[PDB]
Structure formats: structure tokens, C-alpha cells
């Protein structure tokens, strides 16, 4: 076989899960957050996949 | 076989999971956060995958 | 076979898990955080994969 | 076979797990944090994979 | 076979686990932290893979 | 002060939370269940407070 | 002071939390369950407070 | 002071938490379960407080 | 002071935590279980407080 | 002072923690279990407080 990509690719066979991202956010997984009190200014309480590039 | 990529690629066969990211965040995995009190200014309480590049 | 990459690639066969990242965050694994009280200003309480490049 | 990379590559066969990172954070492994009280200003309580390059 | 890399590569065959990092953090291993009280300003309580290059 | 109870009592002052139960079930706390597939005959998947006295 | 109980009592002062149970179940605490697949016949997957007295 | 109990009592002053149980189950504490696959017939996967008296 | 109990009592002053149990299960503490695969028939995977009196 | 008990009592003053049990299970302490694969029929993987009296 032959393949040429510029990116971003994701090429496969017999594949149970696939995610391609440029951005941005993708949530595909099981996630449970239980929480009782959030205070403070300002605290990232429960972050799973996170990116902060403030300018 | 033959392959030429510029990146970012992810090329495979018979593959159960795949993630390609440029960014950005991707959450595909099981995650449980149980939490009772968050205070303080400002404290990253529970971070799993995290990136902070403030300017 | 033949392959030429610029990066970042991830090339394989018969492969159960794959992650490619430029960024950024990717969470694909099982993670359990149980927590009772977070205080202080400001304390990284429970960080699993973490990157802080403040300028 | 033949291969030329610029990096960062990860090239393989018959491979159970793969991670490629430039960044950034990737969490793919089992992780359990149980915690009862976090105080102080500011103390990295429980860090698994961590990078701090404040300027 | 023939291979020329610029780095950082990781080239292999028949390989159970692979990690390539430039950064940054990668957590792929089993990790259990149980903890009861963290105080002080500021004490790295339980660090597994850690890098601090504050300027 | 003086108090005589037969039970079940719960007597207090300055008290943030109170539960009295004879039965029966009482749910007053924060609870998050995230779930993707339940099979089998018959499996208690995620039980928090549970009592089974089949005769 | 004077007190006579038959049980079950719970007598106090200045008390943040109180639970009295005869039964039965009481859930007052923070709880997070994240789960991806449950199979088998029949397996108690994730039990927190549990009592099984089948006859 | 004077006190006579038959049981089960729980008598106190200045007390942050109290639980009285006859039964039965009481869950008042922080609890996080993250889980990816449960199989087998039949396996107690993750049990925190547990009692099995089958007859 | 004077006290006569039949049991089970728990009598105190200035006391941060109290548990009285006859049964039965009580979970009041911080608990984190992270888990990736449970198999076998039948294996107690992760048990914290456990009692099995099958007849 | 004077005290007469039948048992099981737990009598005290100025006491930070108290547990009384007849049973049964009580979990009040910090506990972290991280786990990747459990197999076999049937193996107690990670047991903290455990009692097995099968008949
Ligand atoms: C500000 C900012 C942030 C990210 C960023 C850029 C600018 S430009 C860029 C990029 C995306 C894709 C590619 N190829 C497919 C070769 C090369 C570079 N990124 C990832
Ligand atoms: C501000 C901003 C943020 C992201 C960003 C850009 C600008 S421009 C860009 C990009 C998208 C796709 C591609 N290819 C398909 C080669 C190359 C670069 N990104 C991902
Ligand atoms: C500000 C910023 C941050 C990140 C960043 C850039 C600029 S530009 C860049 C990059 C992305 C992809 C590639 N190749 C596919 C060769 C080469 C470089 N990154 C990762
Ligand atoms: C949104 C937001 C706001 C503030 C903020 C963050 C996110 S994250 C962070 C911080 C992280 C680590 C540290 N040390 C390891 C000393 C100190 C401060 N702050 C201060
Ligand atoms: C779209 C597409 C399809 C296939 C494909 C690509 C892109 S890129 C690639 C490849 C790249 C490098 C290598 N080696 C360095 C051995 C081997 C294969 N394939 C096989
Ligand atoms: C500010 C900043 C931070 C990171 C950074 C850059 C700039 S530029 C860069 C880079 C990305 C990909 C490649 N190749 C694929 C050869 C070479 C360099 N990184 C990783
Ligand atoms: C089948 C069954 C189950 C529970 C059960 C009974 C019968 S009878 C009983 C009981 C309740 C309250 C009291 N007092 C206030 C002294 C004494 C006993 N329980 C708790
Ligand atoms: C089948 C069954 C199960 C539990 C059970 C009984 C019967 S009877 C009983 C009981 C309840 C309260 C008291 N006092 C207040 C002295 C004494 C005994 N329990 C706890
Ligand atoms: C079948 C079964 C199981 C438990 C059980 C009984 C019967 S009867 C009993 C009991 C409860 C409370 C008291 N006092 C307050 C003196 C004495 C005994 N338990 C704990
Ligand atoms: C609801 C339910 C059904 C079956 C069941 C349980 C719960 S719990 C259990 C069991 C527990 C331990 C053991 N060994 C330590 C050998 C063997 C079997 N089974 C078989
Ligand atoms: C309803 C009620 C109110 C008060 C009360 C009881 C019941 S029971 C009790 C007590 C029992 C035993 C003891 N000692 C063995 C020293 C001391 C005090 N008080 C003080
Ligand atoms: C089958 C079974 C199992 C446990 C069990 C009994 C029967 S009877 C009993 C008991 C409970 C409380 C007391 N006192 C307060 C003196 C004395 C005995 N237990 C603990």
C-alpha cells in the first residue's frame, strides 16, 4: 500500500476508536465528576483535558 | 509499503485506540473525580492532562 | 518497507494503543481522584500530567 | 527496510503501547489519588508527571 | 536496514511499550498515591517524575 | 439538660447536617455516576448505599 | 446533664454531621463512579456501602 | 454527668462527624471509583465497605 | 461522671470522628480506586473493608 | 468516675477518632488503590481489611 499525508491524518484498519483533533476539544470517554463546593478566584477545580494559552 | 508524512500522522493496522492531537485537548479515557471542597486563589485542584502557557 | 517523516509521527503495526500529541493534552487512561479538602493559594493538589510555562 | 526521520518519531512493529509527545502532557496510565487535606501556599501535593518552567 | 534520525527518535521492533517525549510530561505507568495531610509553604509532598526550572 | 429516648433519636445543637433513618433509604449527598455499558444477569454495577435481604 | 437511651441514639453538641440508621441505607457523602463496561453474572462492580443477607 | 444506654448509642460533645448504624449501610465519605472493564462470574471488583452473609 | 452501657456504645468528648456499627458497613473515609481490567471467577479485586460469612 | 460495660464499648475523652465495630466492616481511613489487570480464579488482589469465614 501507499500513503502520503500532510497532517494531521489518522489512518488505520480494524480499529475500535479514532480521534483526530486540531483545535479545540474532543471528549469521547467516560467521565464522572462529583463535587460539593468550589470557591476561590480562580481555581481550576477538576480539569481532565485542558489547555490555557491566554495572551 | 510506502509512507511519507509531514506530521502529525498516526498510521497503523489492527489498532484498538488512536488519538491525534494538535492543540488542544482530547479526553478518551475513563475518569472519576470525587471532591468535597475547593478553596484558595488559585489552586489547580485535580488536573489530569493539563497545559498552561499564559503570556 | 520505506518511511520518511518530518515529525511528529507514530507508525506501527498490530498496536493496541496510540497517542500523538503536539500541544496540549491527551488523557486516555484510567484515573480516579478522591479528595476531601483543598486550600491554599495556590497549591497544585493532584496533578497527573502537567505542564506550566507561564511567562 | 529504510527510515529517515526529523523527530520526533516513534516507529515500531507488534507494539502494545505508543506515546509521542511534544508539549504538553499525555496521560495513558492507571492512576489513583486518594487525599484528605491539602493546605499551604503553595505546595505541589501529589504530582506524577510534572514540568514547571515559569519565567 | 538503514536509519538516519535527527532526534528524538525511538525505533524498534516487537516492542511492548514506547514513550517519546520532548517537553513536557508523559504518564503511562501504574501509580497510587494515598495521602492524609499536606501542609507547609511550599513542600513537594509526593513527586514521581518532576522537573522544576523556574527563572 | 435532660433527655430520654427510645430510639432512634438524633439530638444535637449547632449542627450542619442530620439524617435519621429506619427503613429504607436516604440520599442527601452529592453523587455522580457515569456509565457506558451494563450487561450480565444480574450484576450490581454501581451501588453506593445498598442493602439486600431477599428471603 | 443526664441521658438514658434505648438505642439507637446519636446525641451531641456543636456537630457538623450526623447519621442515624437502622435498616437500610444512608448516603450523605460525595461519590463519583465512572465506568465503561460491566459484564458477568453476577459481579458486584463498584460497591461503596453494601450489605447482602440473602436467605 | 450521667448516662445509661442499651446500645447502640453514640454520645459526644464538640464532634465533627457521627455515624450510628445497625443494618445496613452508611456512606458519608468521599469516594471515587474509576473503572474500565469488569468481567467474570462473579467477582467483587471494587468493594469499600462490604458484608456478605448469604445463607 | 457515671456510665453504664450494654454495648455497643461509643461515649466521648471533644471528638472529631465517631462510628458505631453493628452489621453491616460504614464508609466515612476518603477512598480512590482506579482500575483497568477485572477478570476471573471469582476474584475479589480491590477490597478495603470486607467480611464474607457465606453458609 | 465509674463505668461498667458489657462490651463492646469505647469510652474516652479528648479523642480525635473512634470506631466501634461488631460485624461487619468500617472504613474510615485514606485508601488509594491503582490497578491494571486482575485475573485468576480466584485471587484476592488487594485486600486491606478482610475476613473470610466461609462454611
Ligand atoms: C499560535 C499557533 C499555535 C499552534 C500552531 C500554529 C500557531 S501553526 C501550527 C501547525 C499546524 C499544522 C502543521 N502541519 C500540518 C505541518 C504545522 C504547524 N500549530 C500547531
Ligand atoms: C490561530 C490559529 C490556530 C490554529 C491554527 C491556525 C491558526 S492555522 C492551523 C492549520 C490548520 C491546518 C493545517 N494543515 C491542514 C496543513 C495547517 C495549519 N491551525 C491548527
Ligand atoms: C507558538 C507555537 C507553539 C507550538 C508550535 C509552534 C508555535 S509551531 C509548531 C510546529 C508544529 C508542527 C511541526 N511539524 C509538523 C514539523 C513543526 C512545528 N508547534 C508545535
Ligand atoms: C486560570 C488560572 C489562574 C491562576 C493560576 C492557574 C490558572 S494555575 C496557577 C499556578 C500553578 C502552579 C503554581 N506553582 C507550582 C507555584 C502557581 C500558580 N495559577 C496562579
Ligand atoms: C495516507 C497515508 C497512507 C499510508 C501511509 C502514509 C500516509 S505515511 C506511511 C508510512 C510512513 C513511514 C513509514 N516508515 C518510515 C517505514 C512507513 C509508512 N504510510 C504507510
Ligand atoms: C515556543 C515553541 C515551543 C515549542 C516548539 C517551538 C516553539 S517550535 C517546535 C518544533 C516542533 C516540531 C519540530 N519538528 C517536527 C522538526 C521542530 C520544532 N516546538 C516543539
Ligand atoms: C426483620 C427486621 C429487621 C430489622 C428490625 C426488626 C425486624 S425489629 C428492629 C428494631 C427496631 C427498633 C428497635 N428499638 C427502637 C429498640 C428494636 C428493634 N429492627 C431494626
Ligand atoms: C434478623 C435481624 C437482624 C438484625 C437485628 C435483629 C434481627 S434484632 C436487632 C436489634 C435491634 C435493636 C436492638 N436494641 C436497640 C437493643 C437490639 C437488637 N437487630 C440489629
Ligand atoms: C442474626 C443476627 C445478626 C446480628 C445480631 C442479631 C441477630 S441480634 C444482635 C444484637 C444487637 C444489639 C444488641 N445489644 C444492643 C445488646 C445485642 C445483640 N445482632 C448484632
Ligand atoms: C451477588 C454475588 C453473586 C456471587 C458472588 C458474590 C456476589 S461474591 C462471590 C465470591 C466471593 C469470593 C470468592 N472467593 C474468595 C473464592 C468466591 C465467590 N460470589 C460467587
Ligand atoms: C439521651 C442521653 C443523654 C445523655 C447520655 C445518655 C443518653 S447515655 C450517657 C452516658 C453513658 C455512659 C457514661 N459513662 C460510662 C461515663 C456517660 C454518659 N449520657 C451522658
Ligand atoms: C449469628 C450472630 C452473629 C453475631 C452476633 C450474634 C449472632 S449475637 C451478637 C451480640 C451482639 C451484642 C452483644 N452485646 C451488646 C453484649 C452480644 C452479642 N453478635 C455480635
Curated annotation (Swiss-Prot), chains A, B, C, D, E, F, G, H, I, J:
The Sequence repeat ranges on this chain: 1-12, 13-23
Effect seen on changing residue 6 to A: Impairs copper-binding
Outcome (variant: residue 9 to T): In PARK1; no effect on osmotic stress-induced phosphorylation; increases oligomerization
Known tissue expression: Highly expressed in presynaptic terminals in the central nervous system. Expressed principally in brain.
Mutagenesis or variant effect for residue 6 to Q: In PARK1; no effect on protein structure; no effect on phosphorylation of the protein; no effect on membrane- and lipid-binding; increases oligomerization; increases fibril formation; increases secretion of the protein; impairs copper-binding
Phosphoserine modified-residue sites: 43
Record: residues binding Cu cation: 6
Compartments reported by the entry: Cytoplasm; Membrane; Nucleus; Synapse
PTM note: Phosphorylated, predominantly on serine residues. Phosphorylation by CK1 appears to occur on residues distinct from the residue phosphorylated by other kinases.
Free-text comment about domains: The 'non A-beta component of Alzheimer disease amyloid plaque' domain (NAC domain) is involved in fibrils formation. The middle hydrophobic region forms the core of the filaments. The C-terminus may regulate aggregation and determine the diameter of the filaments.
Pathology linked to this chain's protein: Genetic alterations of SNCA resulting in aberrant polymerization into fibrils, are associated with several neurodegenerative diseases (synucleinopathies). SNCA fibrillar aggregates represent the major non A-beta component of Alzheimer disease amyloid plaque, and a major component of Lewy body inclusions. They are also found within Lewy body (LB)-like intraneuronal inclusions, glial inclusions and axonal spheroids in neurodegeneration with brain iron accumulation type 1. Parkinson disease 1, autosomal dominant: A complex neurodegenerative disorder characterized by bradykinesia, resting tremor, muscular rigidity and postural instability. Additional features are characteristic postural abnormalities, dysautonomia, dystonic cramps, and dementia. The pathology of Parkinson disease involves the loss of dopaminergic neurons in the substantia nigra and the presence of Lewy bodies (intraneuronal accumulations of aggregated proteins), in surviving neurons in various areas of the brain.
Subunit annotation: Soluble monomer. Homotetramer. A dynamic intracellular population of tetramers and monomers coexists normally and the tetramer plays an essential role in maintaining homeostasis. Interacts with UCHL1. Interacts with phospholipase D and histones. Interacts (via N-terminus) with synphilin-1/SNCAIP; this interaction promotes formation of SNCA inclusions in the cytoplasm. Interacts with CALM1. Interacts with STXBP1; this interaction controls SNCA self-replicating aggregation. Interacts with SNARE components VAMP2 and SNAP25; these interactions allows SNARE complex assembly and integrity.
Known function: Neuronal protein that plays several roles in synaptic activity such as regulation of synaptic vesicle trafficking and subsequent neurotransmitter release. Participates as a monomer in synaptic vesicle exocytosis by enhancing vesicle priming, fusion and dilation of exocytotic fusion pores. Mechanistically, acts by increasing local Ca(2+) release from microdomains which is essential for the enhancement of ATP-induced exocytosis.
Family: Belongs to the synuclein family.
Protein name: Alpha-synuclein
Originating species: Homo sapiens
Gene name, Swiss-Prot/TrEMBL: SNCA
Region of the whole protein represented: 45 to 99 of 140
Amino acid at each position: 500500500k501507499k500513503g502520503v499525508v500532510h497532517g494531521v491524518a489518522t489512518v488505520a484498519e480494524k480499529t475500535k476508536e479514532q480521534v483526530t483533533n486540531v483545535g479545540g476539544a474532543v471528549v469521547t470517554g467516560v467521565t464522572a465528576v462529583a463535587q460539593k463546593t468550589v470557591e476561590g478566584a480562580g481555581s481550576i477545580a477538576a480539569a481532565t483535558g485542558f489547555v490555557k494559552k491566554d495572551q
